[PDB]
């Protein structure tokens with residue numbers, strides 16, 4: 297698993313990258329009230345979103361990640377903070393269902409599907425993980441990002457290259473950490489996402505813009521966020537059966 301070589305550097309990135317506050321705000325905006333809900337946190341990393349969802353009153357939280365090292369970090373954080381989260385090592389594209397939840401949170405899952413067939417498999421796994429009145433909240437790569445229109449290094453992600461891959465694109469990148477931490481991701485088109493969503497059985501969905509706010513703009517020089525707004529690497533997505 298790629299993040300077996302990243303480990304704690306990902307949390308370092310979340311503490312230093314300018315984009316992180318925006319993605320975190322956007323995801324919790326999409327989630328809304330979690331009181332009493334059962335929650336499945338996919339591509340959970342060290343568990344950030346599932347853990348904070350628990351802190352905000354969810355009834356039961358389960359996290360899944362492909363990286364054994366990241367899950368060992370997640371488990372240690374749950375010990376450190378005395379919380380009841382449970383974790384599993386799985387490739388979400390190939391995993392058995394672990395139950396039907398009120399909410400699936402997938403922050404940076406689908407941009408790691410390494411083929412359009414695996415993108416479609418992941419959406420089907422998510423649908424199988426939801427109650428009929430549940431919802432998927434996802435955060436992924438914006439299909440319209442183009443490397444030539446501006447890199448994201450100033451916001452925490454140095455995108456190194458861009459190459460056709462299947463019906464989409466693949467990108468090598470690094471988180472801007474000390475030292476930088478390399479990873480790869482996949483940029484699937486809006487049409488392929490919407491097809492995967494519908495074919496998995498989600499009859500409702502919407503793309504959600506990143507919630508850049510006035511105070512973000514005020515605390516940087518004018519124009520700092522222009523590449524973020526004109527060539528955004530990220531987007532939210534909410535889907536409902």
Ligand SMILES: Nc1ncnc2c1ncn2[C@@H]1O[C@H](CSCC[C@H](N)C(=O)O)[C@@H](O)[C@H]1O
Nearest residue numbers: 299339340341344361362363387388403408
């Ligand atoms: N196919 C797959 N199935 C499950 N997890 C995956 C995956 N491909 C990548 N990942 C995991 O996705 C994570 C992306 S980093 C994001 C972590 C967390 N959602 C957060 O935002 O804080 C990594 O921990 C990586 O190991």
